[PDB]
Design a protein around this ligand. Structure first.
Ligand SMILES: NC(=O)c1ccc[n+]([C@@H]2O[C@H](COP(=O)([O-])OP(=O)(O)OC[C@H]3O[C@@H](n4cnc5c(N)ncnc54)[C@H](OP(=O)(O)O)[C@@H]3O)[C@@H](O)[C@H]2O)c1
Ligand SMILES: NC(=O)c1ccc[n+]([C@@H]2O[C@H](COP(=O)([O-])OP(=O)(O)OC[C@H]3O[C@@H](n4cnc5c(N)ncnc54)[C@H](OP(=O)(O)O)[C@@H]3O)[C@@H](O)[C@H]2O)c1
Ligand SMILES: NC(=O)c1ccc[n+]([C@@H]2O[C@H](COP(=O)([O-])OP(=O)(O)OC[C@H]3O[C@@H](n4cnc5c(N)ncnc54)[C@H](OP(=O)(O)O)[C@@H]3O)[C@@H](O)[C@H]2O)c1
Ligand SMILES: NC(=O)c1ccc[n+]([C@@H]2O[C@H](COP(=O)([O-])OP(=O)(O)OC[C@H]3O[C@@H](n4cnc5c(N)ncnc54)[C@H](OP(=O)(O)O)[C@@H]3O)[C@@H](O)[C@H]2O)c1
Ligand SMILES: C[C@@H]1O[C@H](OP(=O)(O)OP(=O)(O)OC[C@H]2O[C@@H](n3cnc4c(=O)[nH]c(N)nc43)[C@H](O)[C@@H]2O)[C@@H](O)[C@H](O)[C@@H]1O
Ligand SMILES: C[C@@H]1O[C@H](OP(=O)(O)OP(=O)(O)OC[C@H]2O[C@@H](n3cnc4c(=O)[nH]c(N)nc43)[C@H](O)[C@@H]2O)[C@@H](O)[C@H](O)[C@@H]1O
Ligand SMILES: C[C@@H]1O[C@H](OP(=O)(O)OP(=O)(O)OC[C@H]2O[C@@H](n3cnc4c(=O)[nH]c(N)nc43)[C@H](O)[C@@H]2O)[C@@H](O)[C@H](O)[C@@H]1O
Ligand SMILES: C[C@@H]1O[C@H](OP(=O)(O)OP(=O)(O)OC[C@H]2O[C@@H](n3cnc4c(=O)[nH]c(N)nc43)[C@H](O)[C@@H]2O)[C@@H](O)[C@H](O)[C@@H]1O
Ligand SMILES: Nc1nc2c(ncn2[C@@H]2O[C@H](COP(=O)(O)OP(=O)(O)O)[C@@H](O)[C@H]2O)c(=O)[nH]1
Ligand SMILES: Nc1nc2c(ncn2[C@@H]2O[C@H](COP(=O)(O)OP(=O)(O)O)[C@@H](O)[C@H]2O)c(=O)[nH]1
Ligand SMILES: Nc1nc2c(ncn2[C@@H]2O[C@H](COP(=O)(O)OP(=O)(O)O)[C@@H](O)[C@H]2O)c(=O)[nH]1
Ligand SMILES: Nc1nc2c(ncn2[C@@H]2O[C@H](COP(=O)(O)OP(=O)(O)O)[C@@H](O)[C@H]2O)c(=O)[nH]1
Lengths: 351, 355, 351, 351
């Protein structure tokens, strides 16, 4: 009956929702946090027993790094987790193009290091292991929609690194009988999403424009199409995969496709502005119909050298085997994110 | 791109305590200031966001940031090649001594090999004769001190994975200077603090905890070795010394310090006096506690988890050489530093009890 | 025009044949050699201009390592090759299970290091890059036979590392227009093959048994089936891929399949011994009919945790587009290897 | 009983002599060997129980690398050594200048990895650890002669990396009470010395000239001065340091200084030739007085950008506490190395 989770990447979007979910289920939750010159725990600070004194209760934190083999062994050996969720990563696709080696060492080799730490600790038989796989693996998609058996075609050093991680997880599963699974999750956003992913960038910018604190912002490829769900729904799927009798990989997604362009339009609609588009390519601009003011421009610096044009997930296997369903759909996702960021910018024009 | 009158700095570790003060110092001298920032799942630029041209939109002016990491050789070459700096300040590091004992390999890779990676990037870009290089060395190099006080010629005796990694960095910097005639210097800076100090260094831990106790947000906090003695100065004074070392006619290494020693115990006592509380110590070793004389409440305890397996008992810097050659003088003394940090953290905690 | 080749892995089996092949065409051939406590250039010492003094002519060696980014940039900037062959790797599958992280750093991240070095030197439009990809990418084969479009399924830390390299190569090709190709070569052997690969282990042991220097040796999985060609034929295909008008990936193979058991049988037949099998699984032994002497046993320490049971390559594409044709078939490969090792072992019983 | 040694760097000069030394004392001796495309065990292949079959007796080898933490932990857990000698290193000073990062990773961080592996394996209080420190730490010497209290002043990426390793060993000793020692050994040579160190380079070249297999060879800085002893004497001091009651660091040296130029002159005298020098700097040549033929030239490519001009060790502490004393002196070392290489080159002009 002992339920002890270890979350790498606990400070990120998904880790903070997953920590809450597992705490709610009575888990003792351990996380690995990077040393940083300022604290990086803002998403999970409310999960201290005393947030004012930063005293831990059932969520306990450990300094560590996915590139330091010894610290991972020490932490796993001390914690003896029953479930490990490897969410730690350099997770940004655009940044990965000029941080390609660091991204490989953390996202790819770092997964190996965590798996070898489990094995070193004698826990291959005692641990269930979740790997944060990603729809970026499909890249230039080879099937539509994409399912567990769709061949991968990565399009960034991030995708390539996660492809390494995916297969080394399969190899520990097959070679050593580790209960280890690849959650092949499609894009998921929330009010806690990193600020330079495209959805949170739009909702942040629309909020600042609404409050008169920003006039305009620049985007990259407006025509990219994504399957977007809500991170809070998706972390439950991660836990469900570790409850399955057999270790299996699952696609987690909504199966509904929308463009970056639509996210922009729906976001502005919630602050009472109708965006109309002018021009083409890097000279395209989005203008408020009601005021005539230009609020969106295009800057090639936000483009990727090898774009991922289209993603649409088929989560049939998860729905059948895990009884999982997405709760939040695209329209509600956009409203929630814009409203959250409006309330945030009201408190702090520098947020 | 290089010409006389064009001053372009590249700061690794720009988001840290020193990097934030040094960015301000160089900006006000009219430098174009570039910084390398780690990718982070939330933003880590809190110390320098006020240096955006537009802090509401986070639009850059004369401070320009770049994603990178000292463990990624290619990214360092790309950034240096793009920026073509005249001055490079390598402040980026896993800088915490206690954490380094259980993060030993990461600390070696960043603080030791990362210095070589940055030096090697300068050479790869063909800029050996175009850049001046500042290395963030440290009084932790003296460790178990072989002389008192410590100066440039005092032999090093490191006492942590942090100290060993910074020792590698110190000497690989000397080697690039001697082998390739790079203008590269080691600033051997003794401890320096500020209201921007990391929260888990001992000074900021005390001022934060005293501030929270003052405000009823905390009743008691634990320290480690109360008897450690340190040479403590102010980070804003010390970043000025980094710049002066790069203005020197020849590349020399310099100790930078106050020369005045105080114990952790004394920092605790002075901090509590600023909120009107006198601490009286009872007990010994891990059972020692500090009690408020006026109220009888125990506010300080000792926890062995904050000890270090190999402590650095005593540090005292002799900066005679820098006083003579750089005309550098510390401005903030220990008493003022304590007052400034307690006062700043009282304000912080009153505004945000979760800070 | 200029023909300047840089070969990583020049001391290995393939590098030694490729160096000879390019030298014959008038290339200046540079190689990267690891620092070793003894010399590791035995396969290429005959290509010094003066072998007694080890003075170089048109083959020029450079100390380096695929894990040292700065050293790779210095070498590429000095050599400015027109053609790069990334053959350097920890290439042994069984050893990769105990050396998983080193294998990842050299075979996967090391390929990224070499590509980034090309880019750092400004040579992205000035060099043609060959990557030593491998039939091990197919692992648990998803199609029979296997061709360029067969979905991958790696089965070792080696396979996973090479799959990262495969895809980071594609990404540099697609992102920066680097002329980069994956040669998907199936198993290829020679008298220069590493001694602990299965074919050379057999030819070496048969040679020692013929000379009375050995009585018996042990293998692992006798039922494994492989597509085996000759390394000298296959390095020609590498060069042809870089002569192609456009950067394409190519399978290189014979399309014929034999078992490890069959390799044993044919090798022993060349020293006039008929191997007859008796027993099953780990107790199976091979006995010489003529003499009744046991010469082959099974030791499970040579098994792999996730075996690759069957490989068979379809090189239709390379035959049509490159006019490549293997000239050495399985039976001639066996004769040649046993013949060469008999001569070697006669000269030196400790070889 | 129980005497189980683990030697990293067992294939090198010192590891080969140390293996024999420990085997004679009845140790079970384990080595870590790097995977290489051809075998790298030539110095130790006579220590197989059956050297023709390469079957192990009391010397047992394990594939590994000082940059792969997991493999280090696995080997130490399996072997459970009582004594660990960390001799593995990129040990060449000139190569370290353009292989600076790899040399840091192996010689510096690799030492921490091996120490951390000892700690991870729970052997911090049972194993005795020998670190292969070096007189290169003294670099630009601050005292003559150099002893334990002489301050370090490294002059290469090799020296800096070894200086990190020196102090991290001290830190594990002081922090965790690990019995760990630094052997501060001055230069030591033998007929097994790496061919591109200056002494073996000379004896190889003089031997070839004696056999009419070579006419001339080039050197670097002829006036460098060194304390040279015999590796076979020095490995005994390593063992003695781990027999000491308390873990202490020791200088090991002969206290006698000779120049590279003297090594040349004495080596040629052993083949009946008197070298007379003419010219300066890179134009200096060494001519046989009896014949007038030039046999030695200077090439700046063998210079180092930061030379270590002079080394002379004072091993008073070791003589008093360990009772160690060198047996082979400079004249005997020169004659031994020339004679061995004459016998070697007789067998093979391409050796
Ligand atoms: N969100 C999606 O749509 C999506 C889809 C599929 C897969 N994924 C993957 O799912 C996981 C979580 O997604 P997220 O959106 O929560 O990403 P995130 O917000 O970027 O969180 C990333 C986490 O990884 C940590 N981390 C980064 N480098 C590390 C290192 N070297 N050692 C240890 N920890 C390190 C970060 O720590 P700091 O806070 O210190 O930076 C943070 O805790 C990631 O692996 C991501 O790649 C995301
Ligand atoms: N303060 C002292 O008393 C003192 C005395 C002597 C020497 N030093 C040295 O002086 C320098 C600055 O001191 P500080 O007090 O400013 O330390 P700090 O506040 O800890 O700042 C450290 C900086 O280094 C960055 N960094 C950490 N790991 C990195 C990596 N892998 N790649 C790139 N950047 C990385 C941090 O970025 P994040 O914000 O992303 O963590 C932060 O910007 C450090 O090198 C420290 O070791 C300090
Ligand atoms: N032979 C096959 O059947 C086959 C099939 C497909 C693909 N491959 C791949 O094709 C390539 C050549 O095959 P091979 O049979 O010639 O392999 P090999 O005989 O094992 O040669 C391997 C080469 O890589 C070098 N190397 C190893 N680690 C290195 C490092 N860290 N930095 C630099 N160089 C390093 C080795 O140098 P040392 O001599 O110093 O070890 C050697 O030169 C390899 O990448 C292999 O994986 C082979
Ligand atoms: N000889 C001297 O005068 C002297 C003086 C003081 C200190 N030292 C140090 O004493 C030790 C032995 O001296 P030596 O002359 O015997 O050096 P050596 O002949 O160069 O032997 C070096 C050994 O280290 C191994 N090695 C290299 N890189 C490795 C890695 N990444 N992982 C694991 N093993 C690796 C080599 O393996 P390969 O065979 O695979 O290359 C070889 O076994 C070295 O640490 C050297 O730096 C030497
Ligand atoms: C290093 C940074 O890279 C960024 O690009 P990068 O992450 O791609 O992110 P962007 O796409 O440029 O902006 C995405 C969102 O992040 C916000 N943002 C950017 N920087 C900061 C910051 O420092 N603090 C806060 N609270 N929000 C920031 C910005 O307002 C926008 O809503 C640049 O916008 C910055 O000027 C800087 O150069
Ligand atoms: C990972 C963290 O390591 C810490 O140890 P560690 O850094 O040595 O730091 P400590 O010496 O325990 O605490 C020093 C100061 O850091 C503050 N602090 C600690 N954690 C946080 C945080 O998450 N956010 C903020 N704003 N302030 C924090 C704490 O209130 C105190 O003023 C533990 O105190 C924490 O509970 C947690 O385990
Ligand atoms: C480290 C070594 O790993 C090996 O396993 P590993 O490579 O899988 O190689 P094996 O499959 O055991 O043997 C394959 C062939 O390599 C030869 N061989 C093995 N070791 C050596 C050697 O040191 N020198 C030479 N010239 N030939 C060697 C062996 O005779 C056989 O023909 C073990 O057989 C050895 O005893 C040792 O443990
Ligand atoms: C990579 C090699 O670097 C070397 O420089 P590097 O190690 O500094 O070594 P050197 O100082 O040039 O030569 C030292 C001794 O090594 C021998 N030697 C050099 N290369 C080899 C080899 O491949 N096999 C054998 N058996 N002996 C070799 C050479 O005869 C001489 O006796 C160059 O001499 C080579 O031409 C090549 O470039
Ligand atoms: N991050 C980001 N993405 C953008 C931007 N403009 C367009 N996009 C596109 O939005 C899509 C989603 O990007 P992102 O939120 O970073 O998540 P990703 O699917 O992992 O790449 C990608 O196709 C981007 O190219 C922008 O300004 N920032
Ligand atoms: N960080 C920290 N240091 C403490 C604590 N208690 C005592 N010290 C001592 O205060 C001295 C200064 O520590 P620190 O502020 O981390 O800076 P350092 O000089 O680089 O080690 C060291 O000797 C510590 O052992 C504590 O709770 N936290
Ligand atoms: N290396 C090796 N392989 C063996 C042995 N016994 C059976 N095999 C099998 O032979 C097949 C070819 O192995 P190998 O020559 O190492 O090349 P690989 O195809 O890259 O794995 C694999 O399926 C091995 O499992 C053995 O003793 N050594
Ligand atoms: N390796 C090497 N060293 C040389 C040569 N010529 C002069 N030397 C000098 O001989 C001294 C000893 O060099 P080496 O044998 O490599 O051992 P080291 O003490 O570790 O540098 C150094 O000062 C070298 O600069 C040469 O051709 N090769």
């Amino acid at each position: 009956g002992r339920n002890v989770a270890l979350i790498t990447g606990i400070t990120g979007q998904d880790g903070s929702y997953l920590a809450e979910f597992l705490l709610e289920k009575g888990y003792e939750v351990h996380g690995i946090v990077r040393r940083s010159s300022s604290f990086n725990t803002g998403r999970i600070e409310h999960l201290y027993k005393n947030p004012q004194a930063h005293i831990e209760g059932n969520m306990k934190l450990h300094y560590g790094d996915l590139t330091d083999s010894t610290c991972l062994v020490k932490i796993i050996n001390e914690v003896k987790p029953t479930e490990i969720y490897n969410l730690g990563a350099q997770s940004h696709v655009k940044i990965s193009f000029d941080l390609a080696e660091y991204t490989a060492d953390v996202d790819g080799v770092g997964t190996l290091r965590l798996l070898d730490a489990v094995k070193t600790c004698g826990l291959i038989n005692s641990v269930k292991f979740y790997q944060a796989s990603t729809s970026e693996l499909y890249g230039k998609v080879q099937e539509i929609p994409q399912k567990e058996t769709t061949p991968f075609y990565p399009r960034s050093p991030y995708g390539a690194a996660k492809l390494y991680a995916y297969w080394i997880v399969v190899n520990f599963r097959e070679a050593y009988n580790l209960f280890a699974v690849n959650g092949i999750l499609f894009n998921h956003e929330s009010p806690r999403r990193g600020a330079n992913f495209v959805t949170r960038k739009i909702s942040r910018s629309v909020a600042k424009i609404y409050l008169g604190q920003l006039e305009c912002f620049s985007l990259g490829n407006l025509d990219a199409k994504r399957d977007w769900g809500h991170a809070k729904d998706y972390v439950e799927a991660m836990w469900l995969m570790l409850q399955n009798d057999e270790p299996e990989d699952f696609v987690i997604a909504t199966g509904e496709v929308h463009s970056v362009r639509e996210f922009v339009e729906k976001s502005f609609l919630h602050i009472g502005k109708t965006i109309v588009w002018e021009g083409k390519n890097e000279n395209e601009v989005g203008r408020c119909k009601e005021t005539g003011k230009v609020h969106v421009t295009v800057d090639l610096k936000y483009y990727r050298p090898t774009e991922v044009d289209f993603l649409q997930g088929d989560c049939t296997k998860a729905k059948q085997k895990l009884n999982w369903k997405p709760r939040v759909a695209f329209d509600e996702l956009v409203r929630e994110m814009v409203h959250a960021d409006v309330e945030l910018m009201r408190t702090n024009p520098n947020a």
